[PDB]
Amino acid sequence: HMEFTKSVLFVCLGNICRSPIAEAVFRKLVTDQNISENWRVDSAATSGYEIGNPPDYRGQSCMKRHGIPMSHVARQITKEDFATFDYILCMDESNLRDLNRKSNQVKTCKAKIELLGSYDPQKQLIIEDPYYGNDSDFETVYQQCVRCCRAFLEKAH
């Protein structure tokens, strides 16, 4: 059609709390703006710990509260992910180091690997792991993902 593709992979250690939240925050954003067709959106785990697992039910509750339904099956990052993705946006410092290790074990890294939290207007660098936190901690994570994802959509680093 002469009437009128980009990719982002959100990453944390397990792929059950934070990255699934970001992913569904970003998908909604592109979906509301009619541009989901132009975006490839996904999330993944540096580790194998959670493979096959749905998102954390505490984080799923936070998302239901905010209208945003999460359907994601935990998977571990692959070599292809680095070759196929434009951005790989991770939560914490230990994610980023682990991603960098991974990035030197592949031929082609098309991906910019970075902190999701480096798009924050409120300047909160790290999105911290709520695995041992509570619903306040999950709500804080969600809010951070909205800010960072909105800015990142606005225009990418």
Ligand X SMILES: O=P(O)(O)Cc1ccccc1
Binding positions for ligand X, rule: CB under 6 A: 12-18, 49-50, 129, 131
Q: Least separation, in Å, of the C-beta of 18 and ligand X?
A: 4
Cβ nearer to ligand X, comparing 82 with 138: 138
Instruction: Report d(CA 99, CA 97) in Å as an integer.
Output: 5
Q: Least separation, in Å, of the C-beta of 46 and ligand X?
A: 8
| Annotated catalytic residue, options 17, 18, 42, 145 | 18
| Residue 18 bears catalytic tag | yes
* Phi, psi angle pair for 135, to nearest 5°: -65, -20
Contact assessment for residue 91 and residue 129, using Cβ atoms and an 8 Å cutoff: yes
Buried b (16+ CB within 10 A) or exposed e, 127-144: bebbeeeeeebbbbbbbb
| Annotated catalytic residue, options 12, 17, 62, 90 | 12
Cβ nearer to ligand X, comparing 36 with 47: 47
Active site amino acids: 12, 18, 129
